[PDB]
Amino acid sequence: MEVIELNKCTSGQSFEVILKPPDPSLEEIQKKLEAAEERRKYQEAELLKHLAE
Amino acid sequence: MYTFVVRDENSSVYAEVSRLLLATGQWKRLRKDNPRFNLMLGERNRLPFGRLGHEPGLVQLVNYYRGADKLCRKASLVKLIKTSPELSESCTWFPESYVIYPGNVWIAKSGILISSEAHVIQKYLEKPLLLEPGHRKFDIRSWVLVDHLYNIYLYREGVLRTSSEPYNSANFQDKTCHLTNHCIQKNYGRYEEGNEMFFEEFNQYLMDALNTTLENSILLQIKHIIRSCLMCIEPAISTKHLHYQSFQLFGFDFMVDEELKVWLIEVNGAPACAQKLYAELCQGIVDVAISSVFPLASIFIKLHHHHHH
Amino acid sequence: MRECISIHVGQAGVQIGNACWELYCLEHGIQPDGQMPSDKTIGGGDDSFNTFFSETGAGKHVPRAVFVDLEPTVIDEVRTGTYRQLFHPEQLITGKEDAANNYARGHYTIGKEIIDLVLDRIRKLADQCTGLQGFLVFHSFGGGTGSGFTSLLMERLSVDYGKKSKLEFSIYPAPQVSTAVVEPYNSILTTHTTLEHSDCAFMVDNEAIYDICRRNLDIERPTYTNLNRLISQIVSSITASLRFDGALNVDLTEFQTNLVPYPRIHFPLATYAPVISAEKAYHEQLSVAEITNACFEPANQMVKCDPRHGKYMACCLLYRGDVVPKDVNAAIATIKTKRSIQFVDWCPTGFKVGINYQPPTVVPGGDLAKVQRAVCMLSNTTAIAEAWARLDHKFDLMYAKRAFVHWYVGEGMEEGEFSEAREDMAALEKDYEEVGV
Amino acid sequence: REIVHIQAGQCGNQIGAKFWEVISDEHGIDPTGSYHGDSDLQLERINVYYNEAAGNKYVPRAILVDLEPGTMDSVRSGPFGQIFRPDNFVFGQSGAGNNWAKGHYTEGAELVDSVLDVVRKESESCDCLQGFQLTHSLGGGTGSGMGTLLISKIREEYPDRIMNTFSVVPSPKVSDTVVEPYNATLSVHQLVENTDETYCIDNEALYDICFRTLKLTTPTYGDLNHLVSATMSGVTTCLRFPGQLNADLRKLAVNMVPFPRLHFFMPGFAPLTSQYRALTVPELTQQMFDAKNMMAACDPRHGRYLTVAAVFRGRMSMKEVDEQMLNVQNKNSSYFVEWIPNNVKTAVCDIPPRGLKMSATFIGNSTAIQELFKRISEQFTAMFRRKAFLHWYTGEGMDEMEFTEAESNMNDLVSEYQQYQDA
Ligand SMILES: Nc1nc2c(ncn2[C@@H]2O[C@H](COP(=O)(O)OP(=O)(O)OP(=O)(O)O)[C@@H](O)[C@H]2O)c(=O)[nH]1
Ligand SMILES: Nc1ncnc2c1ncn2[C@@H]1O[C@H](COP(=O)(O)OP(=O)(O)CP(=O)(O)O)[C@@H](O)[C@H]1O
Ligand SMILES: Nc1nc2c(ncn2[C@@H]2O[C@H](COP(=O)(O)OP(=O)(O)O)[C@@H](O)[C@H]2O)c(=O)[nH]1
Ligand SMILES: [Ca+2]
Ligand SMILES: [Ca+2]
Ligand SMILES: [Cl-]
Ligand SMILES: [Mg+2]
Ligand SMILES: [Mg+2]
C-alpha cells in the first residue's frame, strides 16, 4: 500500500494511497431564443384572430 | 392488503407463489408496471433493481439478489471459486475447471461435449456412484432459499435426477447414460416415476446397500458447500441496510462419486421444482421469505455454523 | 490565489446558498456584519478564504456571490435576514413572476429578458477578480428557474468565460418534498442542455437527505431548513480545499482532474459521516475506521444507489478534525478486505485523501451534534446512473402520453427538444453501462 | 401576486358574497375593511385578493356584475356589503330571463364594455396580475351567457393571464327553468376553450349532500351556498396563505392540467357540516376521497384520477398527513393513472377555517367528471331533438347550428375524458 505526495501544513495534510496500479456561440443562443419568442408571437396572433372571428 | 407484481410469466415456482398469495385474501396483484407494490416477482433478465426502494410508505421486497448471477453462470462460478480466498484454487469439492474463450476425461459446457483430447472445460467425474439395479448415474438437486436477513434455508426434500441407462466408460459420444437432465432422458421412468428418486428412497438405498445414511454420507457435505458458496458472496449481495430487500430461490446440483464424496456442478438462479414438491416448497417460500416481511392477520433446515478459531 | 464566484439560482439554489454562506462565515470567523477580526490585512489580501470573500477598505468581507430568482419572496428573506449586511444589493437579483415549474418558461420566455442583467452583475464580480478560476452553480433540477434559467446561464457563461471551470450543486427531485408533477421533464431538459457546459456536478437527491434527517437526526418531518443545514455541511466539506490552506483540490481544475477522467461522466457521489443528532444526550464518539467505513454505506450517500454493482473511476476522502494519515491508511486496508470496491481497469485502485484539522463547525441551535472527526467521500461510481434510470423512466411514462407537453410548447419550445433531451440521457445511461458493467 | 375577482348574475353574486364574507373573516378583515386579527400569516399574502386604501383599509379586488339590480341591492345590504368598492358594481336593468343568448349576444353585449373598464382599472394598478377568477352559474342567463362573454373579452385583452372559474352546474333537483341544460351546454363550450381551470360545483351534489348527509329535508340556496363557500375557502387557501405548493394560479394549472381541455375539477371537503368531535387525520383523509364528500355528482370509482391536490388545514401532525395520503394512494392505486407518477400533491396550512379545528379540501382532475357532462348532454338532447324552447334563443338572433356545434364539442370533451381513462 504505497503512500505518495504527502504534503503537510499547519491546517492539515494530504496524500494519496494506491492499492493497485491499472459550444454554441452568442449568435446561436440568440437565434434559438428569438425563434422561441416568434413561435409564442405566432400562437398569440392565431388566438387573437380566432377571437376576432 | 399487501400488493405484488408478476414480471416473469414462465416461472412455474412464482405462478404458484402468486396463486398462494391471492388465496390468502390479504394480497392484491397489480398490473406489471404499477410502481406501488410491496413485492416484485421479477423478470430473469435486466430486472430494474435501481428502481426499487424509492417509494415512500412501501417496504419493498424482490425475489432476486442483485449480483447472484456470479454464482449462477458456469464461467462466473469457476472464476469466483478460483479467485475467492475462502473457496480457493485448491477447493476440494469443485472439479478442476478452466475458463476457455473462442484418467484424462474432460467435459466442455456453458450443447455439451465429453472427451479425452480437445465455455468451461471441467474434469469429468469418471467414477460416479452408480445406483443398483441398473448400474446408473444421477445428480442431486437441492433447493435453497435465502431470505432478506440472509438466513440460508435448505429445503428438506431434494431430488435425484437419474439416468435409466447403464453407465458406459467406453462411449462418451452416446449421452443418454452420461447426462442426467430431465429433458435428455425424456427406458425412461422404468426404475422410478419420471427418473426422479426422492430422499426417503435414496436413504433406504444407502442403508441397505452401503450401510450408511444420506445425512452422514452426503448431506453434511451438501450443507457445507451451500453455506460456503453463499457466505462467500454475502458482502457483495446482502440487502441488510439497503433501501429495498431481496430474497432468492437457488437450485444447487451435486454429483456423488463412488467413495461418497460430493462435488458441486451447478448453481441455478431460477430453478423449477419436482412436480410433487411444488405445493410444499412454494408454501415455504410464502412463510419464510414473504410473510416474514409482510405478516398476515418447518420444511427447511437453517444452515448456520460458528466454529471458534 | 484565484477567485471563485458562486451563483445561486431559484428557490433551492438561493436557500441552500443562505445555509452555505452562513456556515462559511462561522468557519472563517466572519460576523454577520462582514467584519473578520482575525484578518490582519485590512481591505485586501490573497489568503485562501479570499477565493470566496472580497474585502472593502472598511474591513467588510463580502461573498463573491450572485443570487438570482424570477420571483422575489425568497431573495427578500436574504435582504431582510441575519446576513443582509453581508451582501451588496446588486448581488441579489429578482424578477416579478416565476417560471411556474416549467423549464421552457425559465429558459426561453423569462430567461430571455433577465439574462443580460444577470451576466452584467456577474461581470461586476468578475472585474474585481485578479485570477478568476470559475463558478459554483447551485440550483434544483425540478423548478422552472432552477432548471430552465440555469441551463441558459451555463450556456452564456461558456461563451463569456470560455476558459473557466463550472461546477454544479444540483438538487435531484424527490416526491416527499416536490412541488411539481413535471419535475422529471425539467430535470431531463436541464441535464441535456447543461451537460457540455459543466465540468463536475454534485447531485443531491432530496430523498436521501430527507431520510438521513429522519433516521439520524430524529426529525419526524424534515423541512427545507433541516435539509439545507445538512446539505451545507456536505458543500462546505467539498469546498474546504478552496478556502483553507492545503495541497488537494486547491483549484476548480483539480476537481475535474481528480474526479472526472471521462467528461460526460461528471457526477461524483458524495457520502458523508457521521450525522448525529444534537438532542442525543449520550453520544459515544466515532473513530476514523468507523466514519470511513460509513462512507461505503448507501444510507449515508447523497444519492441512494449501490456502488457494489458498479465500478469506481476515482475516490477522494475529505476528512475534518482529529485524523492522521496512519489511521486513514489502516482504516482503508480493513475496508478493502471487507467490501466490493472494484475500479475500472484503466484507473488505478486508490484514494486521494485530504485532511483539515479543524472539526466541522455547526450552526448554533441546529440539528447536528458537534463531532471530533468527519469525512466526505467523493467517488465517481457508475452506480449513480441508477438515479438517471429512475428519472428517465418517469419521463417516459408521461411523455408517451404527451402529458403536460402543451405547457412547454405554449412557451415556444418545440416538442422535438423533449426527445432530443431524452436521447442524450439514453446515451448517457449507455456510457455508464459500457464503463461499469 | 394579484388576482382579480368577478361575480356575475344571481348565483355568481350570492356565492361570491359568501366567499368574501368567509375569507374576510379568515384574514381578520371586518365589514368596514379594517384589520383586527391576531397573526401576521393573515396579512402576508393579503394583496392577492385585497387592495390597500388610505387608513389601512383592505378593499376586495372584486367586480360585481348583473343585468338586473335585485341581487346587487341585496349584496350591498348583506353583512359585508359596505366592503366592496362602489364603482365596482356594474348593473343593467333589463334582466336576462334565464336566456344565454340575452347574456351573451344582446343584453350582455350592451353592458360588457363598462365591466371591462372596471376590470382594466383594477388590473392597471396590479403590481403583477396573475389572472382572474369568476363566480357564476351555467343554468341562467347572465352568469352563463354574459359571464362567458366576459371571459372571451378578458382573454383577448390579457391573453397571457390565467383564467379560473367557479362554475355552478344546473340540476333538475334544484332547478329554476327547463332551459338550463341549453344554457349550460352553450357555456361549457366556452369554458372548454377559454378557461385554464374550472371548479365544477354541481347543484346535484350540493343538494344530495344537504339531503342525505346533513339530514336537511328541505335544502335552500343558503344551505347549498354553505357548502360552496367552505369549498371555495379551501381551494384558495394555497393562494392566500404562505406555502410551497400550488401557491399561484399558474403553478396549480401546471400541476393539475395535463391536456389543455381537461381542466374541469371535482372539488371535495371534509368534514361535512351545516359540532364538537375532534376529526382525526385518518378520518379527514378517508372522507375527503369519499364520493359523498364530492361537490360534482360523479362516482370517482367510475374513472381515474389524472391529478389531485389535497389541502389540510389546522394544527396536526404532518408525518400523519404524509402517511395517510400515501396510504390512500397505495391501497387505491388503480384509481390513479400510472402514466403520471406522483400525481397527488399535499399542502398543509396551520390556520383552520371558522368553527373547525381541522379540515381537508380535495381538488380532483378525474375522468369520472364525464358523468356530469353526459347528464347535461342527455337533458340537452331530450329537448333539442324536438327543438323545444328554442324560440327564446332564435328570437335573440341565434341559429340552431350554434346548438348543434356546442353539443358536438361537449360530446368530444366526454370522448376525450374516456380516452385517458382507458389509456
Ligand atoms: N433541498 C432543497 N430542495 C428544495 C428547496 N426549495 C425547493 N426545493 C426543491 O426544488 C424543486 C422545486 O424547485 P424550486 O427551486 O423551488 O423552483 P424554482 O427554481 O424557484 O423555479 P420556479 O419557482 O418554477 O420559478 C423541488 O424538487 C423541491 O423539493 C430547498 O430549500 N432545499
Ligand atoms: N464434471 C462433470 N462430471 C460428471 N458429470 C457431469 C459433469 N458436468 C456435468 N455433468 C453431467 O451433465 C449434466 C448436465 O450438466 P449441466 O449441469 O451443465 O446442465 P444444466 O445447466 O442443464 C443443469 P440445470 O438444468 O439444473 O441448470 C449433469 O446433470 C451431470 O450429470
Ligand atoms: N348553488 C347555487 N345555485 C344557484 C343560486 N342561485 C341560482 N342558482 C342556480 O343557478 C341557475 C340559475 O341562474 P341564476 O344565476 O339565477 O341566473 P342569472 O342571474 O341569469 O345568472 C340554476 O341552475 C339555479 O339552480 C345560489 O345561490 N346557489
Ligand atoms: Ca485581508
Ligand atoms: Ca338596450
Ligand atoms: Cl475566459
Ligand atoms: Mg421559485
Ligand atoms: Mg335566478
Short mmCIF file of C-alpha atoms in Angstrom, two decimals, chain B residues 52-233:
data_model
loop_
_atom_site.label_atom_id
_atom_site.label_comp_id
_atom_site.label_asym_id
_atom_site.label_seq_id
_atom_site.Cartn_x
_atom_site.Cartn_y
_atom_site.Cartn_z
CA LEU B 52 -36.64 -0.41 -6.21
CA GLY B 53 -36.85 1.13 -2.71
CA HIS B 54 -37.73 4.68 -3.84
CA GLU B 55 -41.44 4.51 -2.92
CA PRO B 56 -42.41 6.49 0.18
CA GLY B 57 -44.57 4.32 2.52
CA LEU B 58 -44.00 0.91 0.90
CA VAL B 59 -41.50 -1.55 2.38
CA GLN B 60 -40.36 -3.22 -0.94
CA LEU B 61 -39.13 -6.79 -1.48
CA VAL B 62 -37.91 -8.58 -4.63
CA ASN B 63 -37.39 -12.29 -5.33
CA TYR B 64 -33.80 -11.91 -6.72
CA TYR B 65 -30.47 -10.95 -5.23
CA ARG B 66 -28.71 -8.48 -7.47
CA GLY B 67 -25.19 -9.92 -8.09
CA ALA B 68 -26.22 -13.55 -7.51
CA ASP B 69 -25.56 -14.23 -11.22
CA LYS B 70 -21.86 -14.59 -10.28
CA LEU B 71 -22.71 -17.86 -8.61
CA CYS B 72 -25.27 -18.96 -11.27
CA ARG B 73 -23.39 -18.99 -14.68
CA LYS B 74 -20.72 -21.55 -15.49
CA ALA B 75 -17.81 -19.17 -16.35
CA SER B 76 -18.69 -16.85 -13.43
CA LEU B 77 -18.77 -19.72 -10.90
CA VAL B 78 -15.32 -21.02 -11.93
CA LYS B 79 -13.79 -17.55 -11.61
CA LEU B 80 -15.46 -16.84 -8.24
CA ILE B 81 -14.23 -20.21 -6.89
CA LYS B 82 -10.62 -19.78 -8.09
CA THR B 83 -10.31 -16.12 -7.11
CA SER B 84 -12.09 -16.03 -3.70
CA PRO B 85 -9.66 -17.00 -0.89
CA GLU B 86 -12.49 -18.57 1.17
CA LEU B 87 -13.06 -21.05 -1.71
CA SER B 88 -9.61 -21.01 -3.39
CA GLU B 89 -7.87 -22.76 -6.34
CA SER B 90 -7.40 -25.81 -4.04
CA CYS B 91 -11.11 -26.06 -3.02
CA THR B 92 -11.79 -29.86 -2.59
CA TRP B 93 -15.46 -30.07 -3.59
CA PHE B 94 -15.47 -28.41 -7.04
CA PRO B 95 -13.94 -30.17 -10.01
CA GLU B 96 -10.78 -28.78 -11.56
CA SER B 97 -12.20 -26.32 -14.17
CA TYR B 98 -10.77 -23.75 -16.66
CA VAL B 99 -12.49 -20.78 -18.33
CA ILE B 100 -11.98 -21.04 -22.14
CA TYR B 101 -12.86 -18.32 -24.74
CA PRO B 102 -13.18 -18.70 -28.58
CA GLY B 103 -7.63 -40.68 -16.36
CA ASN B 104 -7.79 -37.67 -18.70
CA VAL B 105 -11.57 -37.25 -19.49
CA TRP B 106 -12.94 -33.68 -19.51
CA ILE B 107 -16.31 -32.05 -20.21
CA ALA B 108 -16.94 -28.81 -22.17
CA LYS B 109 -20.08 -26.75 -21.38
CA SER B 110 -21.70 -23.26 -20.93
CA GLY B 111 -24.62 -28.13 -26.37
CA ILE B 112 -22.19 -30.34 -24.30
CA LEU B 113 -19.06 -32.40 -25.34
CA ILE B 114 -17.31 -35.20 -23.37
CA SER B 115 -13.84 -36.43 -24.50
CA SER B 116 -10.19 -37.19 -23.59
CA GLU B 117 -8.41 -34.96 -26.20
CA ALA B 118 -9.61 -31.43 -27.18
CA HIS B 119 -17.28 -22.01 -22.01
CA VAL B 120 -15.70 -24.03 -19.16
CA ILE B 121 -13.59 -27.18 -19.56
CA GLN B 122 -14.19 -29.30 -16.42
CA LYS B 123 -12.72 -32.60 -15.16
CA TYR B 124 -15.41 -35.17 -15.92
CA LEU B 125 -16.05 -37.37 -12.87
CA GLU B 126 -15.06 -40.81 -14.19
CA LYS B 127 -16.06 -42.78 -11.04
CA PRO B 128 -19.64 -41.77 -10.17
CA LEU B 129 -21.75 -43.51 -7.56
CA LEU B 130 -23.95 -45.92 -9.60
CA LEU B 131 -27.42 -46.97 -8.36
CA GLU B 132 -28.36 -50.68 -8.37
CA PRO B 133 -30.32 -52.08 -10.06
CA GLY B 134 -29.29 -50.64 -13.49
CA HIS B 135 -25.67 -49.51 -12.95
CA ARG B 136 -26.74 -45.84 -13.37
CA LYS B 137 -25.60 -42.21 -12.90
CA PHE B 138 -27.67 -39.48 -11.19
CA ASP B 139 -27.28 -35.88 -9.89
CA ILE B 140 -28.82 -34.40 -6.73
CA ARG B 141 -30.89 -31.20 -6.86
CA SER B 142 -31.15 -29.27 -3.60
CA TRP B 143 -33.38 -26.22 -3.29
CA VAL B 144 -32.14 -23.35 -1.14
CA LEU B 145 -33.96 -20.18 -0.10
CA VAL B 146 -32.01 -17.12 1.13
CA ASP B 147 -34.26 -14.64 2.96
CA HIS B 148 -33.87 -10.84 3.37
CA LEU B 149 -31.88 -11.41 6.59
CA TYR B 150 -29.51 -13.70 4.70
CA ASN B 151 -30.67 -16.82 6.50
CA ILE B 152 -29.89 -19.83 4.31
CA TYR B 153 -32.64 -22.42 4.31
CA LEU B 154 -32.16 -25.88 2.80
CA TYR B 155 -35.48 -27.42 1.79
CA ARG B 156 -35.51 -30.86 3.43
CA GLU B 157 -36.70 -32.60 0.21
CA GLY B 158 -34.11 -32.84 -2.53
CA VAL B 159 -34.36 -34.97 -5.67
CA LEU B 160 -32.12 -37.39 -7.56
CA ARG B 161 -32.49 -36.92 -11.32
CA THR B 162 -31.40 -40.33 -12.59
CA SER B 163 -30.21 -41.97 -15.77
CA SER B 164 -32.17 -45.06 -16.87
CA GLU B 165 -29.25 -46.41 -18.92
CA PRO B 166 -26.23 -48.36 -17.70
CA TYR B 167 -23.11 -46.18 -17.33
CA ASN B 168 -20.55 -46.68 -20.12
CA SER B 169 -16.81 -45.76 -19.81
CA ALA B 170 -16.06 -46.66 -23.50
CA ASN B 171 -18.71 -44.45 -25.20
CA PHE B 172 -18.80 -40.69 -24.38
CA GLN B 173 -20.47 -39.94 -27.80
CA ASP B 174 -23.72 -41.56 -26.52
CA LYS B 175 -25.11 -39.05 -23.97
CA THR B 176 -28.31 -40.67 -22.54
CA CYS B 177 -26.17 -42.54 -19.90
CA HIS B 178 -23.67 -39.69 -19.22
CA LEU B 179 -26.06 -36.65 -18.84
CA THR B 180 -28.83 -36.75 -16.17
CA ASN B 181 -31.10 -33.85 -17.30
CA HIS B 182 -34.90 -34.48 -17.25
CA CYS B 183 -35.31 -33.50 -20.95
CA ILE B 184 -32.30 -35.58 -22.14
CA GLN B 185 -33.88 -38.72 -20.59
CA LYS B 186 -37.47 -37.96 -21.97
CA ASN B 187 -36.03 -46.97 -20.74
CA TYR B 188 -37.30 -43.65 -19.21
CA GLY B 189 -39.37 -43.97 -15.98
CA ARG B 190 -38.53 -47.71 -15.51
CA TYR B 191 -36.99 -47.75 -12.03
CA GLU B 192 -38.86 -44.74 -10.66
CA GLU B 193 -41.51 -42.28 -11.83
CA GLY B 194 -40.08 -39.66 -14.26
CA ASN B 195 -36.45 -40.56 -13.46
CA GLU B 196 -36.89 -38.92 -10.00
CA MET B 197 -35.89 -40.72 -6.77
CA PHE B 198 -36.59 -38.84 -3.57
CA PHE B 199 -34.74 -38.78 -0.24
CA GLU B 200 -36.76 -41.43 1.67
CA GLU B 201 -35.99 -43.99 -1.06
CA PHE B 202 -32.36 -42.92 -1.63
CA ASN B 203 -31.69 -43.01 2.15
CA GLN B 204 -33.21 -46.50 2.26
CA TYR B 205 -30.89 -47.50 -0.57
CA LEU B 206 -27.81 -46.10 1.17
CA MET B 207 -28.75 -48.06 4.28
CA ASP B 208 -29.45 -51.40 2.56
CA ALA B 209 -26.59 -51.37 0.04
CA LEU B 210 -23.92 -49.26 1.68
CA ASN B 211 -24.70 -49.44 5.47
CA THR B 212 -24.81 -45.61 5.98
CA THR B 213 -27.31 -42.76 5.78
CA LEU B 214 -27.99 -39.90 3.39
CA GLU B 215 -27.36 -37.42 6.26
CA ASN B 216 -23.89 -38.76 7.06
CA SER B 217 -22.56 -39.80 3.67
CA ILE B 218 -23.85 -36.90 1.52
CA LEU B 219 -25.91 -34.16 3.24
CA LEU B 220 -23.21 -32.92 5.66
CA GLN B 221 -21.11 -32.21 2.53
CA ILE B 222 -24.07 -30.67 0.67
CA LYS B 223 -24.72 -28.24 3.62
CA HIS B 224 -21.06 -27.33 3.85
CA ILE B 225 -20.85 -26.49 0.13
CA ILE B 226 -24.09 -24.41 0.07
CA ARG B 227 -23.06 -22.46 3.14
CA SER B 228 -19.52 -21.82 1.79
CA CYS B 229 -20.82 -20.62 -1.58
CA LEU B 230 -23.40 -18.27 -0.18
CA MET B 231 -21.32 -16.82 2.69
CA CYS B 232 -18.62 -16.07 0.13
CA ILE B 233 -20.82 -13.72 -1.95
#
